[PDB]
């Protein structure tokens, strides 16, 4: 029926900041949207709750989802360690776009990023699968703890997450 909505409750050094919610585009990328949905509810017995945004670059993006190595080298999908690029129907049009991190063709896992600018050079290379719905102000707040090389000045965590609606 209706595209799912998920939330993240963000904290900064363990202090609550606020909530970001996302629309996931199951109508266009059902397999990639499902992966992110189920990681967010934790229903397969693993997922995003307690993980961090390990790399944040102001004027670029906030990246997270590495719940096995905590640093951009780990993570796994609900389909296996890696899965294929589903399609590239949606493009990186500006701030708020949710897209899959990868290390080569057909290597999607659990890592994702939230754009904070237009990143058109990733079109056709990273699968876009959602967008921030509410709390873009919380994303901009998070983004101020990043740096040019992406190291964060305070620890940015998903204190809680799950499905709304
Ligand atoms: N190689 C990657 O997955 C990165 C692409 C640029 C945005 C952060 C994820």
Swiss-Prot record:
EC number: 5.2.1.8
Keyword Isomerase recorded: yes
Activity regulation (record text): Binds cyclosporin A (CsA). CsA mediates some of its effects via an inhibitory action on PPIase.
Outcome, altering residue 60 to A: Loss of ability to stimulate MAPK/ERK phosphorylation
Keyword entries, A-Z: Acetylation, Apoptosis, Cytoplasm, Glycoprotein, Host-virus interaction, Isomerase, Isopeptide bond, Nucleus, Phosphoprotein, Rotamase, Secreted, Ubl conjugation
Subunit-level organization: Interacts with protein phosphatase PPP3CA/calcineurin A. Interacts with PRPF19 isoform 2 (via N-terminus). Interacts with isoform 2 of BSG/CD147. Interacts with FOXO1; the interaction promotes FOXO1 dephosphorylation, nuclear accumulation and transcriptional activity. Interacts with integrin ITGA2B:ITGB3; the interaction is ROS and peptidyl-prolyl cis-trans isomerase (PPIase) activity-dependent and is increased in the presence of thrombin. Interacts with MAP3K5.
UniProt protein name: Peptidyl-prolyl cis-trans isomerase A
Provenance organism: Homo sapiens (Human)
Name of the encoding gene: PPIA
């Amino acid at each position: 029926m209706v595209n799912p909505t998920v939330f993240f409750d963000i904290a900064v050094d363990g202090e609550p900041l606020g909530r970001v919610s996302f629309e996931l585009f199951a109508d266009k990328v059902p397999k990639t949207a499902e992966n992110f949905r189920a990681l967010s509810t934790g229903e397969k017995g693993f997922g995003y709750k307690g993980s961090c945004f390990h790399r944040i670059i102001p004027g670029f993006m906030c990246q997270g989802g590495d719940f096995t190595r905590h640093n951009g080298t780990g993570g796994k999908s609900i389909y296996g360690e890696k899965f294929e690029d589903e399609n590239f129907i949606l493009k990186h049009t500006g701030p708020g776009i949710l897209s899959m991190a990868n290390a080569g063709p057909n290597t999607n896992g659990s890592q994702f990023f939230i754009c904070t600018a237009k990143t058109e050079w990733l079109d056709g290379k990273h699968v876009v699968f959602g967008k921030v719905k509410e709390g873009m102000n919380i994303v901009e707040a998070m983004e101020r703890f990043g740096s040019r090389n992406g190291k964060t000045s305070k620890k940015i965590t998903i204190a809680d997450c799950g499905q709304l609606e």
